[PDB]
Design a protein around this ligand. Sequence first.
Ligand code: CLA
Ligand code: CLA
Ligand SMILES: CC(=O)O[C@H]1CC(C)(C)C(=C=C/C(C)=C/C=C/C(C)=C/C=C/C=C(C)/C=C/C=C(\C)C(=O)C[C@@]23O[C@]2(C)C[C@@H](O)CC3(C)C)[C@](C)(O)C1
Ligand SMILES: CC(=O)O[C@H]1CC(C)(C)C(=C=C/C(C)=C/C=C/C(C)=C/C=C/C=C(C)/C=C/C=C(\C)C(=O)C[C@@]23O[C@]2(C)C[C@@H](O)CC3(C)C)[C@](C)(O)C1
Ligand code: KC1
Ligand code: KC1
Ligand SMILES: CC1=C(C#C/C(C)=C/C=C/C(C)=C/C=C/C=C(C)/C=C/C=C(C)/C=C/[C@@]23O[C@]2(C)C[C@@H](O)CC3(C)C)C(C)(C)C[C@H](O)C1
Ligand code: SF4
Ligand code: SF4
Lengths: 132, 165, 36, 185, 167, 73, 122, 146, 164, 80
Amino acid sequence: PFPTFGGSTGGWLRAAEVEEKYAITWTSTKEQIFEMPTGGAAIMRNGENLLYLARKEQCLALSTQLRTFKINDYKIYRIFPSGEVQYLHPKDGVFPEKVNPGRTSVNSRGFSIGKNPNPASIKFSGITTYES
Amino acid sequence: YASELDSMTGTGIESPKVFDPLNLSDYVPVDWARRAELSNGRSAMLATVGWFFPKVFGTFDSTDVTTTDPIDAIMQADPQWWAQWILICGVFETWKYKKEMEGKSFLGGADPAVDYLKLWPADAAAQEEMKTKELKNARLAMIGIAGFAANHFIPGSCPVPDFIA
Amino acid sequence: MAASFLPSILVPLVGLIFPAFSMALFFLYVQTDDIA
Amino acid sequence: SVFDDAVKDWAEEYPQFAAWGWGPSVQAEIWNGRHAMFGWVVMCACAYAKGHGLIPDADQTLDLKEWGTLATISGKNTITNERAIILIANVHALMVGLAATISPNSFADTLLLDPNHPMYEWQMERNSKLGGVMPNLGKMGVTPEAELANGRMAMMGIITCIAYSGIQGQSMIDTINEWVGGAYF
Amino acid sequence: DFSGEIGAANAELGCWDPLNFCTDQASFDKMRYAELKHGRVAQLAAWGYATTWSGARFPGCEDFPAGHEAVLKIGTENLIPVLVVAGALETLWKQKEGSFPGDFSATSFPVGFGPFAKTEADMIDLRTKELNNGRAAMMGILGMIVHEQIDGKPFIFFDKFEIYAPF
Amino acid sequence: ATKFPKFSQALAQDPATRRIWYGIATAHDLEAHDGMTEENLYQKIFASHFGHLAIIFLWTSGNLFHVAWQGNF
Amino acid sequence: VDLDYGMKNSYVPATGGDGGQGQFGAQSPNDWRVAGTSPVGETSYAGAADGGEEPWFAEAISTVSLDLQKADETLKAFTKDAAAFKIEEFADAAMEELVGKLGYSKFLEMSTKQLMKTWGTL
Amino acid sequence: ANFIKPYNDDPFVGHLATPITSSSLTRALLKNLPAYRFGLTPLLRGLEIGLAHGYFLIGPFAQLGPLRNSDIGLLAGFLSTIGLILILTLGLTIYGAAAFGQEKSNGSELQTKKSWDQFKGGFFVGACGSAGFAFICLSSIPTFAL
Amino acid sequence: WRDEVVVGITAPVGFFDPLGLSKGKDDATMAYYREAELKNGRVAMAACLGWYLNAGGVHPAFNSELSNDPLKAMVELPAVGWLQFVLGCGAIEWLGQQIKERPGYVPGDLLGASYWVDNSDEGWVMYQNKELNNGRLAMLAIVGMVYQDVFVGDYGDMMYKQLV
Amino acid sequence: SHTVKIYDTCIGCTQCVRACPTDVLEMVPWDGCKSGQIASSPRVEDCVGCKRCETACPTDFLSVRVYLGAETTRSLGLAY
Ligand code: CLA
Ligand code: CLA
Ligand SMILES: CC(=O)O[C@H]1CC(C)(C)C(=C=C/C(C)=C/C=C/C(C)=C/C=C/C=C(C)/C=C/C=C(\C)C(=O)C[C@@]23O[C@]2(C)C[C@@H](O)CC3(C)C)[C@](C)(O)C1
Ligand SMILES: CC(=O)O[C@H]1CC(C)(C)C(=C=C/C(C)=C/C=C/C(C)=C/C=C/C=C(C)/C=C/C=C(\C)C(=O)C[C@@]23O[C@]2(C)C[C@@H](O)CC3(C)C)[C@](C)(O)C1
Ligand code: KC1
Ligand code: KC1
Ligand SMILES: CC1=C(C#C/C(C)=C/C=C/C(C)=C/C=C/C=C(C)/C=C/C=C(C)/C=C/[C@@]23O[C@]2(C)C[C@@H](O)CC3(C)C)C(C)(C)C[C@H](O)C1
Ligand code: SF4
Ligand code: SF4
């Protein structure tokens, strides 16, 4: 289910084999040319498409481009060398820009940015002002 | 001494039991030691012949090396000869390596690495006799080349016939 | 032996041997995965 | 004893080096003793060759246009022929030693205790056996004990020769000659 | 008879016969007999040419020219005995029926693989060496004669061989 | 703290050549090092000051030695 | 398939200036520092591909893939809590009705009242 | 018709099969070089590589070094080559230490500490011996005149 | 082999073996024949180009001291140059034999173009034919030029110089 | 990994989330503002530190703050 692509020198390197790799799948309703983030143009297949990339940012750039094609079913995974997979995006089946019940807020501080403590007040504690 | 020496060729009649007074076989493994004994001994056989061959039978017809002294001939010989001699020895060593990789032997095994006159018999006892003869003449030639060298550097150290000293 | 020989003795040790060994040691230390 | 405490404390202060056998180890004692014995041979040869004038043009200096600035001692004053010759002989020995350090064979006594070398266990066993103040008179001939004892004797002799030459205000060659009853000069 | 015989160029080419001179086994056997005979004669010829041309004469003939001039200057009475000896030999060698061409072990006087060979591989290797040296020597005598009749040095880089014989 | 620099976990885990550079550039910023206390900071500074004074006296001794040995004073 | 496989890395978060390991882990659990290429017949590292007669390009051979079945299964495994939340708020069998009637991705995408509407049909 | 295609029929790997990377000449050469050739011991790989390099390394030193116009120029070139080989051997040694650690190697593959030590020793011997061989060869250059 | 090979068969003469030197030859023998035809043709093409350059006077090596006559420059070249030429070609030949052992090797295809294209493609067959025909012409041309230089004394152009 | 904090001046405009190139941020329910949502950064392991989110934020001062810290492969944006 690979798109029609003649190859490039911009693809993944040894890291994809030994550290981590990324995959993006999506469904197209016709054969259409798109821009590979790694350089050059590829032809989407009618139906399911799968593409491997070195970085998550490359997958998200491609997904941003897919949105201009009216394609919103893309899924982004991370694959480890052992073959374990992580489903990354959209994490809960809903795009992060659309508020969703069941998400919990992470990393909020209940005050305006001007109320962080003074550095001299936490010297030698090992913490930063934004984490305390 | 090592235990494997018991099942090895090298004991004879002049020394029917394993001769290793210094127990040098605790340090040099027997396979390496025997390969090196044969290497040094074969080189010493050739050396013992070449020590006197040009003096007794004449040199070739060249002026490159005018002396018949075995030692003073070294620096007189052209370095192109020495480079090609090193090269041919390297060719020999490569042949030995390749033959041993092919399951052949230059250490008295079954299939000879080098036997161009077709003299290796198919009998284990006859092969044992041949191996004993080669090793005896190898040790004798090592002794002889050492003696020639000693008498040359230090006259009288070894009873070498003065005409081939 | 005389002290007048010391430059030609010491300069190659200070300017070639010492930097090479120091650089090799620092390389080995920075490549070590568990130092403590 | 002070010896065990000393070695242990040195290892605790320099663990990375102590791993390879560097420092006050049995391995270093063995290797430095071997070198001291060979060096007694070389020093005696130098004394004998100086006494009999067997080194050609010993007091003549090397040509600057031939060997260049590397052969200079101060300005354009060049090293003598004798010193260059002694250096070259020791360089022969040093090239042998570098070949042995860099490319040991499998049954060889390596310079450092490398866990991956096939001699590591034998080396550790031998080094554990050697130790003590008096040489083992039970063990003689070509044995590690005798080798260690003679290496110690050679290093002691080097120290005593340097010290005696210093006290007498004479050269080390002069001491070597006067210790063999003036057999060289 | 084909690539499984003695003298094949190699395994891939096999019996190298661009002119299709070998079709059945009978033609190949006749051709191999002729080839082995020519190679033996040419080995002897190259030996003798190199020997005489290098200034070496048998007692009695210390004045005769060395190369092919020895067939124009030496009188018939000295050339004839070679024919007599060769004829005596032609009537003597007898091919063992059932063996390879050039196997003359059926000869009256004893001939064959003596202590030289024990195994079949040894005999095959010895035969291949005889045949290969025969082919090389055929080329060699041809080249010697051509280069003598062209410029006078049958050996193109030197004039005479200066043999080393210690004994 | 398992790799160089042992004073910074954040740097020791960087997988790039940056880890080396920053280690060198942060070695003397003892206040920022992992697990530093005030007392240890003052003690390490005291010892480093002894080292610096040793360097100064070595430099002066060397100037004196080179003039004495090789100069025309 | 373990879900914390990414988190079980060797990255030890620092006490300051470090966001730590987030939802999936700060880094891969696999040590990227492996050997360079190797001669014919040998492997550079544990799971390395055998480059056959061209070991110098051995690293250009892929041993990491994503087959569609693994994709669907890890999609379900990683979003099991979100689906559990959606059924908890819309309200076992009901989830099997919804996720087969319209789909699993659509079930994630819809709303509890909308699913209360599609549950009206049977 | 198309002399370029994705390497390993994988469009998304960062490599292309071109005549330079995938010709029969390139493949035969690379598979036969001692760094890759099947069946060599690590020591023999190191030895062959050292033999190849030390022979040519003497040339620049002999012909262009400071003492090139002295009559000991060849000897100085050989000494310079030996010094370069020592520098390279130090590089190989510390590389192996970094890349493989100091633990006992579990295998005989070249990319292991024990095998890399064998390879480094073979390289040192091959390079120094090859520099010496080139010194001998340069001591007497044949004109090739009959 | 005759019902398998398409490269080398071209217009005017089609398949050209009047002497019947290909009948009853095995596939290995005909592969040898094609490899030899190609190698002789390629060497002859290179020889023709080099001869033309030398004859024209464009031989700037050795301070252009060598004779414009290629057969004289052949002997004025020192021995070591010929030794290098022969040994370098020998090394290339060794590598070529290694290539030849490989499965699916197409006789004369050192580049291994079979990894990308085959004779089912028309243009590739056509370009192979261009190579082969120019090789045949260059073999004839090098023989003819050597004749004209040896027996007729003239080492240059005797066909088109007479026009202009 | 970088640190990304959301302060309570967030008006839930979702612009930082749309700006993020590596999907670090997401909108979560919250009763602190009129829009009924606040930004969140649950996936800081993938934050590269580009600060596009800060460029997108309309409040004064910023409601999303990126503090750069310990570098990883992911935060350095390495394809190798
Ligand atoms: C130890 C071996 C050895 C070495 C290093 C030398 C070295 C030398 N020889 Mg001496 N020589 C030797 C043995 C040796 N020789 C032997 C065995 C003979 C009798 C054939 C001679 C007879 C001889 C004569 C007449 C002359 C020399 C001369 C010289 C000098 C010039 C080189 C030369 O032309 O010699 C030629 C050397 C040979 C022909 C040696 C034979 C070649 C070997 C032994 C063949 C072995 C191959 C074997 C069958 C297969 C290997 C099996 C397996 C390992 C693969 C040079 C110093 C010349 C000189 O200047 O003297 C003053 C000279 O005129 N040599
Ligand atoms: C970068 C340009 C450059 C070049 C070409 C040179 C060249 C030279 N320098 Mg100089 N020099 C330079 C910059 C340069 N220098 C700089 C920046 C400094 C510091 C200020 C110096 C300071 C200096 C000093 C003090 C000396 C020199 C000397 C020399 C000479 C000897 C050097 C030598 O033997 O190296 C050895 C070279 C090598 C070991 C290898 C060379 C590279 C090889 C040939 C590349 C091969 C690649 C191959 C073709 C690829 C494909 C091969 C195949 C497998 C496909 C040589 C003429 C010495 C001299 O006496 O001059 C007359 C000398 O004493 N230089
Ligand atoms: C006074 C007193 O007390 O004594 C005196 C006596 C004496 C003699 C004066 C003195 C001396 C010197 C000594 C002891 C000299 C001993 C010399 C000795 C023992 C010399 C062997 C040479 C072997 C050769 C040349 C082999 C070539 C064989 C070759 C080239 C081969 O190819 C090997 C071969 O196997 C294969 C590979 C393949 C086969 O198909 C073919 C063969 C079979 C050939 C002393 C020291 O002064 C003491
Ligand atoms: C009673 C009993 O048992 O008897 C037994 C004993 C024994 C000994 C065991 C047996 C045997 C074996 C025998 C008879 C072996 C004899 C072999 C022989 C006589 C072999 C010639 C080779 C010449 C060649 C290959 C080519 C040369 C020349 C070539 C290739 C040239 O180009 C010529 C040349 O001039 C030029 C043109 C150009 C120069 O630039 C080069 C040179 C100079 C070279 C037998 C058969 O078993 C019989
Ligand atoms: C059809 C293919 C072709 C080849 C393969 C070829 C080869 C050579 N030509 Mg010829 N030639 C033409 C065609 C070809 N030439 C044409 C169409 C014309 C009319 C313009 C023409 C005229 C001249 C003139 C006046 C001279 C000449 C020469 C050479 C010589 C040196 C080559 C070089 O170095 O450029 C080599 C053998 C010179 C010469 O013979 O010097 C002794 C010389 O003076 N040519
Ligand atoms: C391995 C690297 C390498 C070096 C460093 C090198 C160097 C020189 N080459 Mg060589 N060369 C090859 C490789 C190398 N060459 C190979 C693989 C081949 C076979 C394709 C080859 C062929 C020829 C031919 C035909 C000639 C030739 C020459 C010279 C000469 C010029 C200076 C001079 O000698 O004046 C210098 C020293 C000419 C010559 O030696 O003329 C007497 C000459 O005619 N070469
Ligand atoms: C007891 C112990 C104490 C201790 C101690 C004391 C005094 C220790 C004594 C140490 C001192 C006495 C150790 C000298 C060795 C002699 C050297 C190695 C000789 C090398 C000689 C060799 C390497 C060199 C040879 C050459 O040079 C020669 C000869 C000629 C040249 O041509 C060739 C060569 C290069 C080969 C502590 C540590 C203070 C505290 C602890 O708590 C208790
Ligand atoms: S800094 Fe960049 S990568 Fe990080 S959260 Fe903001 S927009 Fe996303
Ligand atoms: S952090 Fe800023 S950009 Fe993001 S939702 Fe809040 S106000 Fe909007």
